[PDB]
Design a binder for this molecule. Structure first.
Ligand SMILES: CC(=O)N[C@@H]1[C@@H](O)[C@H](O[C@@H]2O[C@H](CO)[C@@H](O[C@@H]3O[C@H](CO)[C@@H](O[C@@H]4O[C@H](CO)[C@@H](O[C@@H]5O[C@H](CO)[C@@H](O)[C@H](O)[C@H]5NC(C)=O)[C@H](O)[C@H]4NC(C)=O)[C@H](O)[C@H]3NC(C)=O)[C@H](O)[C@H]2NC(C)=O)[C@@H](CO)O[C@H]1O
Length: 129
């Protein structure tokens, strides 16, 4: 699934991400854009052999199990493939845990480099929310 911008904002809002740990909805939409281009099937390989999965590019190094990242964790207790579903419930539920893990949204490398300190409310411009 490739989500639309407001489509994803609405899904993220329904699922409770708006102001979750003080991160307004625009932060989440900005992160998803630069990490996956809003594509639930997105995957990427890290230098260490881990793989990032889904709309929020959740790293198998820490958060999900793919059977091929020796030494890794599965802190969201899900198969990484579940993070590729058209239903974002798994990804959002897992994201809530990631953002609460100490570094806030700095966990998303694209958020820190491209979203942090910028006018993120612009990512939900026009949405019926
Ligand atoms: C090629 C490429 O660029 N790929 C990227 C990919 O890297 C991106 O995925 C992200 O990867 C990074 C690096 O692997 C992940 O960042 C990890 O995440 C760890 C888990 O949250 C994090 O560990 C946590 O660190 C906290 C802060 O230090 C710990 O809490 C603190 O512990 C202190 C001392 O130990 C203690 O004194 C404090 O009380 C406490 N501080 C606070 C504020 O609470 C916490 O314990 C620890 N958690 C665990 C479970 O061990 C690492 O710090 C962090 N590494 C970094 C920043 O280098 C990140 O999670 C991945 N993101 C996602 C969404 O999966 C990917 C997505 O951005 O993009 C690809 O393109």
């Amino acid at each position: 699934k490739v989500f639309g911008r407001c489509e994803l904002a609405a899904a993220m809002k329904r699922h409770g991400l708006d102001n979750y740990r003080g991160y307004s909805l625009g932060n989440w939409v900005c992160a998803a854009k630069f990490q996956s281009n809003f594509n639930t099937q997105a995957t990427n390989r890290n230098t260490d052999g881990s793989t990032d999965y889904g709309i929020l590019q959740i790293n198998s190094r820490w958060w999900c199990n793919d059977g091929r990242t020796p030494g890794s964790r599965n802190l969201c207790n899900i198969p990484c493939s579940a993070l590729l579903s058209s239903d974002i419930t798994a990804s959002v539920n897992c994201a809530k845990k990631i953002v609460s893990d100490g570094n806030g949204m700095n966990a998303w490398v694209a958020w820190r480099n491209r979203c942090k300190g910028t006018d993120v409310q612009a990512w939900i411009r026009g949405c019926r929310l």
